[model samples]
Target: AISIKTPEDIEKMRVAGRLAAEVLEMIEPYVKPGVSTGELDRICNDYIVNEQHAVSACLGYHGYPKSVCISINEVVCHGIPDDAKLLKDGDIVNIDVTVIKDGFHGDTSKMFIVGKPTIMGERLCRITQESLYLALRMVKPGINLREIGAAIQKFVEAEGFSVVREYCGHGIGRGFHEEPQVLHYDSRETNVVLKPGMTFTIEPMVNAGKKEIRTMKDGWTVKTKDRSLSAQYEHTIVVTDNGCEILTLRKDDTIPAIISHD
Candidate 1:
């Protein structure tokens, strides 16, 4: 069920995506050791509400309490951030954010390693980011959506990691999660043709061990069954006539935000 998005919708999404990207940039220094996840959420909430003047999509939707989703260590995704969850040295965390501006939504997330990182943790994080980059580079009109996940799975598996199948990315626009689910691993279900003006997110969660995952009793947090560290990276992008534009691209990203080709 692809949603029809217009040029005006895409323009508003650019603004929303920029603000969401700024939240990640603003929270970078605070991701260090000794900070509480709840504190980080508050900081981001303040920025979105006051500075960015945008509304948080994570709050209240489906009873998600926090303004941001901060998952630590073996936690795969949707780990609820709270005062009890504190970052320590050698810890890796993922901060997922979604913001709404002008009735359009922008969603993105990235991995952060606190203090010193384990060799395995650092490696997983880097490969996951590269996997996403590789997938986005292949985006263009008429390409099958399966290629996106296939590219990610091939690269991640070659690196000896597994992609989590429990959760997948989704189209984002007026709705927080929209049509055409995007999976990180190759599958026939996502075998659809991509088109211009279509906007969605590509977030791949790479695990150091088996892809099997377990959901915590909290009904929100998900963690790797093997307790292997997990890393993830996400970006909201829209297909263009030329190619694609990364809506949530940050300045530090080595890849160009816009990659267009024939």
Candidate 2:
């Protein structure tokens, strides 16, 4: 269920979220081609430990063996970043970051394009990001969790894209994953009411092909069944009286919309 945090707990989460955002920002500068995902994981681990003095929630959490989840291209989620997993030009990757600070947690994910990708791939990525924002803009008190997924699904599918139904979003505050699971496609479940002090994540994984997917032999990595490319975006959010707030948001001067948002 829902683990509503107190004011003190929320403050702790704010700190954790800010530090986590900084960690992601710190790694973005090194996301050029020829770099391995494992190296990026190490950079994240070191940044969390040495610079932020925080713990990686992914490590030792639910038997996850990595500090971060580096999902590249067709891999949907939980793609273990190994030393051999190198990024080539025109590849798209998603780096998921979660950190624990002051006994609270912060989590977020964003898609990245390495080198120059195909026109279609670039359009898909941008569309997925816009779809996520469209869904987030609808979050508010008394809203249903189903709408979160439905809005995203409608927008994405309207653009001739599909949403992955297997992996969804979840509550993130005191726990890494908590109550009220958020699916990208509508199950039409009771609209879960939003309230002040509630915090969670809304990430929709969009595929360039069918919505169906399969888990890799690694037992963690999920890939598109049709072998088409995929893209995803996530943000740790808190319900506010005005609307919602993005906790794991990093300052991206390049993304003007990110800096100036509602």
Where does candidate 2 stray beyond 4 Å? 253-262
Residue 170 of model 2 has an lDDT of: 89
Which lDDT tens digits does candidate 2 get at residues 109-173?
88888998878889888998888777777777777888777778888999888999877888887
lDDT of 1 by residue, 123-164 (tens): 999999999999899888888889888889999999999999
Model 2: weakest 10-residue lDDT segment is: 253-262
lDDT of 2 at 203: 85
Cα RMSD of all models vs. native, in order, equals 0.9, 2.3
TM-score of 2: 0.94
Query: Candidate 2: lDDT over CA atoms?
Result: 0.83
lDDT of all the models against the reference? Answer: 0.92, 0.83
